[PDB]
């Protein structure tokens, strides 16, 4: 089919090991979050659970195609075939993607080379609580993510205009807590491997 | 041989088949007929606001590419070929760590009718959210949802 030949042409000669613009400029990843539910806050283990739809948008010049079709609205099959950012959550004690019935991932490629990659995630993130004012205590629990291997010179993250979306906030599993609000931050963190762009969401 | 004809039929069916594209792409909307047989309604976890349910989850759909003509109208085939064809990416919106049973083999079945009608069943244990009113507890009653749909494909 037309889409079949388009996909074969795009994958022909493609090297998923190399990020786009390997020696030109950093790859810019626009990140977006939808929070289905912030699970219970486990004060014993200094952690809380959060379920999200996590979306990342970037540009790959190799995936440009010229056709009457303006977008290839694909499924999880080519996620392992194209280059994907190695985004990881820094403060996660335990995290897992969703695999029932199929891997909960979505891939869309536009004719100009824009790739949108979304996936469902459930993350247990550590939140160091200061319980001096317990039970009249308030906390600002973070959720930080960055690129594991690519420093700031290779990958840079940006928050979209609609960065973090929430649904029915007060219908979540926060039995002992009330959600007041959230905010978004970006920072550069120095490590032995290099300097990395860490993006944080505080609840 | 009796089985070589079916081997050739399967090879010709999968030859040139692209499982990255849904049936009827650019021609129509892929209609999936679904039914759920609950083999056991699992216990309700009040602490987790959650309940377990064991289901045979059946989905059926048309695929013109998989039409064939042969000695039998229906090919009851091994589930391993289901990975080699397009199947809907159904997921549970309110699910929480469901498990696809794989003892001894993957508990799935795939059947292809001569007219290209596919039937595809899975065995699952779904753990789903059930928000609760505990103000009338223990005189309380709930309506636990089970919501599912495609992840990648819009209406």
């Amino acid at each position: 089919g037309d889409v079949t030949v388009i996909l074969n042409n795009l994958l022909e000669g493609y090297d998923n090991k190399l990020r786009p613009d390997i020696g030109v400029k950093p790859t810019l990843i626009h990140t977006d979050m939808y929070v289905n539910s912030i699970g219970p806050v486990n004060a014993i283990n200094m952690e809380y659970t959060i379920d999200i739809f996590f979306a990342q948008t970037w540009y790959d010049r190799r995936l440009k195609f010229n056709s009457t079709i303006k977008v290839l609205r694909l499924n999880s099959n080519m996620v392992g075939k194209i280059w994907i950012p190695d985004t990881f959550f820094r403060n996660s004690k335990k995290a897992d993607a969703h695999w029932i019935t199929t891997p909960n991932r979505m891939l869309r490629i536009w004719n100009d080379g824009r790739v949108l990659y979304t996936l469902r995630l459930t993350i247990d993130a550590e939140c160091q609580l200061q319980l001096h004012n317990f039970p009249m205590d308030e906390h600002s629990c973070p959720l930080e993510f960055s690129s594991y291997g690519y420093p700031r010179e290779e990958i840079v993250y940006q928050w979209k205009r609609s960065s973090v979306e929430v649904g029915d906030t007060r219908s979540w599993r926060l039995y002992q807590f009330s959600f007041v609000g959230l905010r978004n931050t970006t920072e550069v963190v120095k490590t032995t491997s290099g300097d990395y762009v860490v993006m944080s969401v505080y609840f | 041989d009796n089985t070589t004809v079916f081997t050739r039929i399967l090879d010709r069916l999968l030859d040139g088949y692209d499982n990255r594209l849904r049936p009827g792409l650019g021609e129509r909307v892929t209609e999936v007929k679904t039914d759920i047989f609950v083999t056991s309604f699992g216990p309700v976890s009040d602490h987790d606001m959650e309940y377990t349910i064991d289901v045979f989850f059946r989905q059926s759909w048309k695929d013109e590419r998989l039409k064939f003509k042969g000695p039998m109208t229906v090919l009851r085939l091994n589930n391993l070929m289901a990975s080699k064809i397009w199947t809907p990416d159904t997921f549970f919106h309110n699910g929480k760590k469901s498990v696809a049973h794989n003892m001894t083999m993957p508990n799935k079945l795939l059947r292809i009718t001569e007219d290209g009608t596919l039937l595809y069943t899975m065995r699952l244990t779904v753990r789903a959210e059930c928000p609760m009113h505990l103000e009338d507890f223990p005189m309380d009653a709930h309506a636990c949802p089970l919501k599912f749909g495609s992840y990648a494909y819009t209406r």
Epitope: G167, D168, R170, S171 | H93, N94, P131, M132, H133, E135, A141, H142, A143, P145, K147
Partner: nanobody
Amino acid sequence: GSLRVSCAASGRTFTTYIMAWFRQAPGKEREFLAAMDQGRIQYYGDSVRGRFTISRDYAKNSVDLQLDGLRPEDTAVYYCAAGAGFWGLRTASSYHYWGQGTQVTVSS
């Protein structure tokens, strides 16, 4: 023409309710029109499918109904309901809260 009917609520820690709209034409019969879930899932009646669209502002604790393609047969009094859907989500008996109601009339 086009119209928008809003319905606001307050005075409860209770949230986990479907919020829905019902219609009374002259004749004393309740007709389900639309409903919206806590999962932002929208259910619509067959008669008014694709015409009326329901939405919910959860922070403001309100439900809005945008009405389009109105016709003379749509003249009626519209009621806003909120409640947990037990044995229901399409029957009026499952909603334990109702409003005053608002009239709408179409003149050709």
